[PDB]
Amino acid sequence: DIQMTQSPSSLSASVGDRVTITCRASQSVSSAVAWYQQKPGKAPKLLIYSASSLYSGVPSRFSGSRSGTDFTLTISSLQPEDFATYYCQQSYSFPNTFGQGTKVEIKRTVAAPSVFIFPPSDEQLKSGTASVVCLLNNFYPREAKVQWKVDNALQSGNSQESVTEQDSKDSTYSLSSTLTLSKADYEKHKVYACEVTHQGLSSPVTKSFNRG
Amino acid sequence: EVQLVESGGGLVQPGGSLRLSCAASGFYISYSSIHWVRQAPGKGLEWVASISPYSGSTYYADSVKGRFTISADTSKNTAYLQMNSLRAEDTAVYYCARQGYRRRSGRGFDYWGQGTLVTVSSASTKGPSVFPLAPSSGTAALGCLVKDYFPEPVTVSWNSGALTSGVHTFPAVLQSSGLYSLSSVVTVPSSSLGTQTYICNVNHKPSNTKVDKKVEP
RNA sequence: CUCGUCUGAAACACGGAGAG
Ligand SMILES: [Cl-]
Ligand SMILES: [Cl-]
Ligand SMILES: [Cl-]
Ligand SMILES: [Cl-]
C-alpha cells in the first residue's frame, strides 16, 4: 500500500505565525489527498480535498498544495482555535492510508498556575484509601513539576498526573496530581503539601492543609 | 442535518467478535461511500474498510482483511462492521465517515461520526466510585474524583449540563491496579458557594452505572 | 468497445461526456 509520511510529528508556533505541514507519498497519488483537523477527543473535520481545494466553510487561512508526491498544508496566520492534530490522507488507491499526524501547539505568553489542594473526602476515608488532589489551573507552558510532601517528607512512587489538552481560546493547560495513600498512612500524619514549580512562578508555590 | 451515529462498542474478550453499527440520517448511504476509520488511544487515524455505492464493492486494510466484514442495509440506512478474532491491537475508537460528493469535495471524508470505543481485554467490567472534591479556603475550585473503573469511558457533566464554563475533566490515568481514575473540576464564584448547589453527574455505560454526587463546602 | 481522464448522489461495475 501507499505510505504517507508526515512531518514534523509536532510543532509549536505563536498566534499569527505561518505553519507548514508536509506529507510525502511513497508513490504518485495524483492529487487525491485530503487534510483533516482533529481536536482531542473529537471527530476529525475535513479541511482540504484534492490536494488544493478548500472545503466549504473552512477559513481561508488554510491552504493545500501539491508538488509531485509532496503535499503541504499551510496555515497562513495561526489562531488559538487551530490547536489540533492534522492528518493527510490519500484516496488514490485502495487501501486508503493516513499520515501519522502533526500535533500543533499554540505558543503563548507564560502564565503561572493557580494551585488548589483537596483533602480526601470523609466518604472515601470510610474505605481503606485516601486520595489527595492538587489542581494546577490555566497555565502555560505545559511543563510543570508537582512534588508531594507528607509531614515535610518527600513522597515517591505514589502519585499520578493528568493534563488537559490545550484550551482552544486562551491556549492554557490544567493539571491534576493525585497522591494515593492507605487510610492508615493518611491518619498517621498531619501536614499534606503539594509543591509546584513552573516557569511562571518566581519561587515554588506550596498549598497545604492539616488533617483536621 | 447530516448525522452519523456509531454504536455497538464496548469490552470484548481477545478472540471474540463484535459488530459495530453506523446509523446515518439526513442523507442516504445508498448514494455515498461509507468508511470505517479507527484510532487507538493516543495514536493516529487508521483506515479500516469501506463500501461503495451502486456496486456495493467493499475494500479492506491489510491488517483486518479476512477478519472484518463491512456491509450496509439501505432500508435501515445503516452501515455495519463485523469484527472477528479481535486482538488487543484492535482496541480503538471506531469512526464511521461519509465520503462526500465528488463534485463538491472530491474523495474527501466530509462528515465523521463521534466514534465508539472498542476495548479488547480479558479484564472484568467495574463501575466507578465517585467522591467529592470539596471547595474550601475571589474564585473557588471544586470537583469530583471518579475512581477505580474499567473499561473506559466515563462521561462527567455538572448540574446536568447546565454548567460548562470553567470545567476541566482530565484524561483518565491507569492505576497500578489496572483500573482507571479521573477527576473533573470547575471554578465558580466563592460568593455563591452557600446558595448555588453543585452536582457532578457520572455515567459509566459499560457497568450500567449512573451517579450524581453533590459537592458542598 | 477502449481508457492510469471527466461526469450521473458513482475511485470498481453501469449510464452519459470527451478523445480514439
Ligand atoms: Cl474566512
Ligand atoms: Cl517528487
Ligand atoms: Cl490527630
Ligand atoms: Cl461494578
Q: Which of A100, A135, A156, A175 to mutate to test the interface with B (most CBs of B within 10 A)?
A: A135
Q: What is the DSSP letter of B128?
A: P
CA angle B142, A39, B150 (to 5 degrees): 60
Helices (H), chain A: 122-126, 183-187
Residues A10 and A100 in one domain: yes
Closest among A114, A90, A88, A68 to A9, alpha carbons compared: A88
For the record, the C-alpha cell of A57 comes out as 466553510
Nearest amino-acid residue to C5, taking CA and C1' = A30
Residue with the three cell numbers 464493492: B57
Residue with the three cell numbers 456496486: B55
Cβ of B45 within 8 Å of Cβ of A98? The answer is: yes
- Provide the positions of strand C that have an atom within 7 A of a protein CB: 4, 7-14
The DSSP H or E segment spanning B202 is strand B199-204
Residues A132 and A201 in one domain: yes
Q: Could you tell me which chain A residue has the CA closest to the CA of B110? A: A46
Whether domain B129-214 has CATH 3.40.50.1100: no
Prior bond of A95 cis (ω within 30°): yes
Q: Domain holding A67: CATH number?
A: 2.60.40.10
Q: How far is the CA of B56 from the C1' of C15 (A)?
A: 17
Q: How far is the CA of A2 from the C1' of C8 (A)?
A: 29
The experimental method, as deposited, was: X-ray
B53: CB within 7 A of chain C nucleic strand: yes
The DSSP H or E segment spanning B103 is helix B102-105
Residue with the three cell numbers 474564585: B139
Q: Does residue B127 contact residue B148 with C-beta atoms inside 8 Å?
A: no
Closest among B23, B10, B25 to B79, alpha carbons compared: B23
Resolution attained, angstroms: 1.9
Residues A94 and A68 in one domain: yes
Last residue of one domain, picked from the residues A83, A107, A131 = A107
The Cα–Cα gap between B35 and A55 comes to: 19
Q: Measure in Å the smallest separation between the Cα of B145 and chain A Cα atoms.
A: 9
Measured in Å, residue A126 CA sits from the centre of ligand 4 at 18
Residues of chain B with C-beta less than 8 angstroms from the C-beta of A127: 129
Residues A23 and A70 in one domain: yes
Domain with A63, as residue range(s), is: 4-107
Q: Does residue B107 contact residue B101 with C-beta atoms inside 8 Å?
A: no
Last residue of one domain, picked from the residues A54, A83, A107 = A107
Q: Which fold has domain B3-120?
A: Immunoglobulin-like (2.60.40)
Closest nucleotide to the alpha carbon of B106, via C1' = C11
Q: Does residue B179 contact residue B97 with C-beta atoms inside 8 Å?
A: no
Measured in Å, residue B126 CA sits from the centre of ligand 4 at 4
Residues A72 and A125 in one domain: no
Last residue of one domain, picked from the residues A80, A107, A134 = A107
